[PDB]
Amino acid sequence: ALSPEAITSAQVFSTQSKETYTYVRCWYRTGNSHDESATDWEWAENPDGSYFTIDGYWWSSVKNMFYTNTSQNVIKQRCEETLGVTHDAADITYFAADNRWSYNHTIWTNDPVMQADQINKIVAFGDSLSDTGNIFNAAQWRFPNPDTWFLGHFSNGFVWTEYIAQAKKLPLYNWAVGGAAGSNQYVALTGVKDQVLSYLTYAKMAKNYKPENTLFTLEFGLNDFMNYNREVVDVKTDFSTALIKLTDAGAKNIMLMTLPDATKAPQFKYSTQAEIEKVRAKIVEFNEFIKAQAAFYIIQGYNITLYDTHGLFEQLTQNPQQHGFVNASDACLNINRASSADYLYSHSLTNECATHSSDKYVFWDVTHPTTAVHKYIAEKMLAPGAGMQRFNFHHHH
Known part of the structure; x- marks a missing residue:
């Protein structure tokens, strides 16, 4: 299939240079207990109610992933504030999507330069x-x-x-x-x-x-x-x-x-x-x-x-x-x-x-x-x- 060595450093530079934006689909359990698996979603919003967006770049070999500098805690918070679920089994999860026809894409928060162990x-x-x-x-x-x-x-x-x-x-x-x-x-x-x-x-x-x-x-x-x-x-x-x-x-x-x-x-x-x-x-x-x-x-x-x-x-x-x-x-x-x-x-x-x-x-x-x-x-x-x-x-x- 495909190996990491197939990717050249020119391709890595080129992929990391493409700074774009996308929306976040916030999913939540609609029922109030684990007996009910049904979910629904809304787009993440900013504190004012306008649509939330994350900056970054996309990458895949065929099954796109979005790389951002926006922290994972920030994204979760934005989904929790938007949905405002008041039941215990909200079990919120979040993904990158441009529109309603797009499927659920993983958001990857890029690591910082200052890193220890x-x-x-x-x-x-x-x-x-x-x-x-x-x-x-x-x-x-x-x-x-x-x-x-x-x-x-x-x-x-x-x-x-x-x-x-x-x-x-x-x-x-x-x-x-x-x-x-x-x-x-x-x-x-x-x-x-x-x-x-x-x-x-x-x-x-x-x-x-x-x-x-x-x-x-x-x-x-x-x-x-x-x-x-x-x-x-x-x-x-x-x-x-x-x-x-x-x-x-x-x-x-x-x-x-x-x-x-x-x-x-x-x-x-x-x-x-x-x-x-x-x-x-x-x-x-x-x-x-x-x-x-x-x-x-x-x-x-x-x-x-x-x-x-x-x-x-x-x-x-x-x-x-x-x-x-x-x-x-x-x-x-x-x-x-x-x-x-x-x-x-x-x-x-x-x-x-x-x-x-x-x-x-x-x-x-x-x-x-x-x-x-x-x-x-x-x-x-x-x-x-x-x-x-x-x-x-x-x-x-």
């Missing part, structure tokens, strides 16, 4: 456990259905990387691509190493970029073993290639996680016991490769953190009450089958899930965890002595 952004690689909108924009906002899945997330709200970024007051730049059944119809199945290569081309257009100051998150293989029936040896090769690529490019801070036992998801109520054991054995074997890769990069001198998401998902499915949940075996939504077509449609919650609330359910659909589970994983990764102390964070009064 503090973490100044989060960069996510992964699948439908991390995706915040990449398959959604490729599907022209049809997949997953925005009435039932929260604006491009394969959940009813924020994913675990977004809650980590909120807690650390950092921006999150997502490269994760949802590989859920039916995703292959919008973009062809590419490796996590292709997400690293795509990232690297965008970071080459960024100003004053120091990859040692990025917190990278990497989770892959769930969709590869669940529906793309990949072999452990091939996912191992794609995973290790990606880590060689990231660390050769100067990454120093990486967060890794084991895969949860996918076979516990409600979709496996419609599977054979043979398919259960086959999928489980792949995960168990691949988790041991994730653990070895982490220990290898710790000995090489990198700042690695590893989180046992698998151990947590066992505890959650074994005894959901012990962790603040009520149900760990059923889909909150009234979906009684495993079909790719179901992501194209809106669905009601079951009577049982409307009674307990989606915050008490482990699973949102037949595959994916609820936003409450994502928030729980983030809380555990954030806990004192759970590993994040090894990263250089800024303090905020």
